[PDB]
Amino acid sequence: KQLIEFVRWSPERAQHYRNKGYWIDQPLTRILTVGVQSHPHSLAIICGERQLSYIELDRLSTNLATRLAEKGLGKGDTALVQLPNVAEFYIVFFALLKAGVVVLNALYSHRQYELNAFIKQIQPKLLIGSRQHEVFSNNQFIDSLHDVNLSPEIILMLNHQATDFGLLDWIETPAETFVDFSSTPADEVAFFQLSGTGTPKLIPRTHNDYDYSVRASAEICGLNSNTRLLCALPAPHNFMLSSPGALGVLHAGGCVVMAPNPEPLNCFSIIQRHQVNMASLVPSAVIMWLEKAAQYKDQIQSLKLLQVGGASFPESLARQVPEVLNCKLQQVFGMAEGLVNYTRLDDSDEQIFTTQGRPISSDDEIKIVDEQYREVPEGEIGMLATRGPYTFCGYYQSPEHNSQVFDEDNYYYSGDLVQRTPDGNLRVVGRIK
Template identity: 40%
Template sequence: MLDFDGFPEEFARRYREAGYWRGETLGELLRRWAAAPEPRVAIVDDEQRRWTYAELDAWADRLAAGFRALGIDRGDPVVVQLPNSAAFAAVSIALFRLGAPPVFALPNHRRNEIVYLCEAAEAVAYVIPDVHQGFDYRPLAAEVAGRVKTVEHVLVDGDPGEATALRDVEAEPCPLPGPDPADVAFFLLSGGTTGLPKLIPRTHDDYAYQLRATAEGLRHDENSTYLAALPIAHNAALGCPGLLGTLLVGGKVVLPPSPSPDDCFDLIEEEAVTLVTLMPPLVLMWLESAGFYDVDFSRLLIQVGSARFAPEVARRIYSELGATLTHWFGMAEGLLTFTRLDDPLDVIIHTQGRPLCPDDELRVVDDRDRDVPAGAIGELLTRGPYTLRGYYRVPEHNAKAFTADGFLRTGDLVRFTPEGNMVVEGRIKDVINRGGEKVSAGEVEDLLITHPAVREVAVVAMPDKLLGERTCAWVVPRGEAPGLEALRSFLRSQGLADYKLPDRLELTDGFPHTKVGKVDKAELREQVAARVTG
């Protein structure tokens, strides 16, 4: 069994009494719709195969029985590295039913990450595709199994090679002991830019609440269609409401092969898509391509995550696509804030809205953990009914990441408007200390992205002997590359103070990304540091 303490009993009791936790387990989320008299489509995969709820439910039952026959039991972690596919859903739900928590690896993880995840979780099995986007996962799996003693089974969706085919594992459904609602349902991965990710335990209780509440907040129901453009191993596309939340309410999930307009735009029309989750760079890609397609976006709600989203780009969702926007802040660790569908446009564009749950507790503090005055910027601390109380098996890290009374230190700098909406100002590491003057990277980025010659931008600190740090703007140009002085003049015209202007411009064809898909600012800081000190 897992070494997992869970939520303190005082808080668990509070969340149950408030009705957030209802004793649900995630393995049951298909049952109601599978038993409906009329067949309902649950998933449309990237080959346009349509899986009904009854078919997906039966597949998950057969897999759960097969996993049990292999000796996989309640509390046995299984690393799952599958792309967006019906198999991802069937395997995950089968493991939920068995009580064996999947560890959701991303398709682009390789040996170092997978070995680490298997060792950290003491995984008993590893589930992979045969080949995805030209990469053969079978040699990787053989190497992992050879290095990690606990991994007894490699299961392959497709041609198994020397391993075991997922299809050959299926068995006649049988009674299963199942999990307790307080058990770990699965593990997500932390999104830090340095080091290997931490394991985030999410329980059946807390994630069932998240699925239900996010679906209700977006009026997402059995008549809705979710386009999973992002990897469904991410929290955003897995359960906000994402794949699992859509299946919970009886909607349809469409799995395109990629988030590109070529793969998504026709599906939006053909499948009557009502909700999609995108990150800001993908929004820009869609905006720039929309004019080449004859697509009606008017029914589409675009859920934009990420810490910051430039207001001018947000406005273009309305003016150029005719779609609507819900602006989110979220983390795999738990806390979600978002703008509601009835919020005024200025709130949607300029804020990340309000917390999902009335019992989300938020503090904004200075560097000594003192609450800042109302409206001031500080670090966000949080705890609540779906926010973890500790990363898995890293007590030393947890001692730093949490306060003594259980608040998670998010590392995000925020402020609250008088109306109670949260505005994310950046990460703690995104504040550049330029000779004692503090420069918010996000503020400069929001202005630079509106320049016609700027396609993408990331602002980072670079070392300086005199001031300690100066400001470097990394830019992916649109058309003819801009010059530093042109950008500085533009920023002055937008009212930016001189001390906030970039001191250096670096042009690039594209940004490095972390394993969870965020711009890797740590790498950009390292690159510019090497150039200015080399």
């Protein structure tokens, strides 16, 4: 009956973050509950031909939660989920949040090796995947787990075979018998994020810290109930999920519009069809869009805001976003470990085109340090160290690595090389291995 173990914030910091109104001690399911009360029939998710309202998202995720609870899956248990960019990803995410099951969302691009590693670490009693994924093409992988005593109690499959438990069947109808269930407490783990050598590391995220980053991001990006956000990046990625991502849009009462990937022609027609007004991309995908955008200018006119995060996004490329994609640019530099930086919507051109913005929170603390861990003079390049109301305090079950990436004041060293501009924004300059 024990809850998942994780490294806590110091009580003085926890109190401060409550005093500031950052941590409001609500489960992530708050996003749905509130949406259902205010606008139950407005669209929450558009996926291909499907239109899921707020109340449908709520009903369906409740259905699945009741069936997991009926099977004795709840607080103290974990789940591994691997689904593509479809509405069922969010139905499942909210169901597990409701049931108090700590979920790890694998990327759909992850393979047997990553999945095996994730299973050993969290020992999930629930596994949800797709029969269309290579790893679940046959039963070779599933059988291998019995051999090592790592078989989950329940396996659900999207695109199921006749002898599978069908994910859609566990979603469409509630359980026959009532068993009590609830979310994990708000200052306890809700789910595992993944770091971005070796398999990704597990980042425990609490309801308090994740909800805060979501609510605060939604305000920064000016989301509202008319927001239609394209979800073309992997749905589980911190960027696509929380920055402000699908959760941010749901928090603001808007609609998520799914796309399987960032391929421009398909994305452009989805943008046109649903009048998408916001999208989020990495630089390699921005380039692809730029190459087709002149010719398909008509299809993408409705875009009002494009977020770009990730690799290297030089000024000359950034300036092409408003020029060619005919929308405002926002640069985003974040990490699944916590800290996210945004250029603001009212920042100057120079800030927007040449920087990766500034932190969500006035209580995001940042040190920029040299090789001897001394704070560099203002404006100079150094290694980023950070802590704040939504930055984690250690990887899951990883005390040795944690000791190497945190200092005594619990600052996290991300490996990023940055400099603070005279205007107050960060410029990401490189990485230390």
